[PDB]
From a paper:
The biosynthesis of betalains involves the enzymatic action of 4,5-DOPA-dioxygenase, which catalyzes the key ring-opening reaction of DOPA to produce betalamic acid, a crucial intermediate in the pathway. DOPA-4,5-dioxygenase (DOD) is an enzyme that catalyzes extradiol aromatic ring cleavage. In this study, the properties of BvDOD were characterized, and the first crystal structure of this plant-type DOPA-dioxygenase was determined.
The crystal structure of BvDOD, which included 263 amino acid residues (Asn6–Thr268) and one Fe atom, was ultimately refined to an Rwork of 16.70% and an Rfree of 22.00%. The crystal structure of BvDOD conformed to the P3121 space group and accommodated two molecules per asymmetric unit. Superimposition of the Cα coordinates from the two molecules revealed a root-mean-square deviation of 0.186 Å, which highlighted the high degree of structural consistency between the two forms. The enzyme displayed a single-domain structure with a mixed eight-strand β-sheet surrounded by 10 α-helices. A crucial feature of BvDOD was the presence of an interior pocket containing a mix of hydrophobic and hydrophilic regions accessible from the exterior. This pocket, approximately 20 Å deep and 585 Å3 in volume, was strategically positioned to facilitate substrate binding and catalysis. These residues were strategically located within loops that connected β1-α1, β2-β3, and α9-α10, respectively, playing a crucial role in maintaining the active site’s structural integrity.
Author numbering: 6 to 268
Write the structure that this text describes.
């Protein structure tokens, strides 16, 4: 049914209201210009939900979680009450367990963190498509998440839109900006990633720690990068990666987003 998986950049919560971000106009054009098909359900691997073992969201309605401090009060008024899919949740449990993940937990009470509901509120604003969330295991490695994606790969034939939500670059809150360029280290890293992805060098991206330039500056902590790996795996071995968006915030926080097309 569905032959694509995506990695997008959840940005920061300001992307719900800051229209000075091309990221927002990009996400808003989702159903018209990016993915026209209506998916049966949506699975989001969001970087803002990390756990020790794979964890799935099992609720019939997602609560809208404001996992951010220090923003306009308008942001805490938002509700993206999309349904959950216990169907999909179980399907994910079984698919993951069937591939070697013996311990895979479930949370029957939590909804969507801003890593899911902020983008989804722009792409699918009616809030009527089931959204189920998968967690990222930050203290593991990239290959683990590639495998989590491979395990999820069959979900596509069942109308599931697999989306990893992170940031192409996620420099520390302590990294200094660039006044009117794009920081050299960040362009190096983004260039590396594109060259890897568009050529299907997925083993390389699994091994970013030993092949990417400036990865410690780009991803000091991996959580915002591992959803890329998951979408990568879910697309498949010979999928075709395309860069569908890029924009920068401080000259250092890339918003790059990729579409993986299985063949
Ligand atoms: Fe974030």
């Amino acid at each position: 049914n569905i032959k694509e998986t995506f990695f997008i950049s959840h940005g920061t919560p300001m992307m719900a209201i800051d229209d000075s971000k091309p990221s927002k106009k990009f996400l808003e054009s989702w159903r018209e210009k990016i993915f026209s098909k209506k998916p049966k359900a949506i699975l989001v691997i969001s970087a803002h939900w990390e756990t020790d073992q794979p964890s799935v969201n099992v609720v019939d309605i997602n609560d809208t979680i404001y996992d951010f401090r220090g923003f306009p009060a308008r942001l805490y008024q938002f509700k993206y009450s999309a349904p959950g899919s216990p169907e999909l949740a179980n399907r994910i449990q079984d698919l993951l367990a069937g591939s070697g993940f013996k311990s895979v937990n479930t949370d029957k009470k939590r909804g969507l963190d801003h890593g899911a509901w902020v983008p989804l509120m722009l792409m699918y604003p009616e809030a009527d498509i089931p959204v189920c969330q998968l967690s990222v295991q930050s203290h593991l490695d990239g290959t683990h998440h590639y495998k989590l994606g491979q395990a999820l790969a069959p979900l596509k034939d069942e109308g599931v839109l697999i989306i990893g939500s992170g940031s192409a670059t996620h420099p520390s809150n302590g990294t200094p900006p660039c006044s009117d360029g794009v920081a050299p280290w960040a362009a190096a890293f983004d260039s590396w990633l594109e060259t890897a992805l568009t050529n299907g060098s997925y083993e390389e991206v699994n091994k970013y720690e030993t092949k990417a330039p400036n990865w410690k500056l780009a991803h000091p902590w991996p959580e915002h990068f591992y959803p890329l790996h998951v979408a990568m795996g879910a697309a498949g071995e010979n999928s075709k990666a395309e860069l569908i968006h890029n924009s920068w915030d401080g000259g250092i926080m890339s918003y790059g987003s990729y579409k993986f097309t299985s063949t």
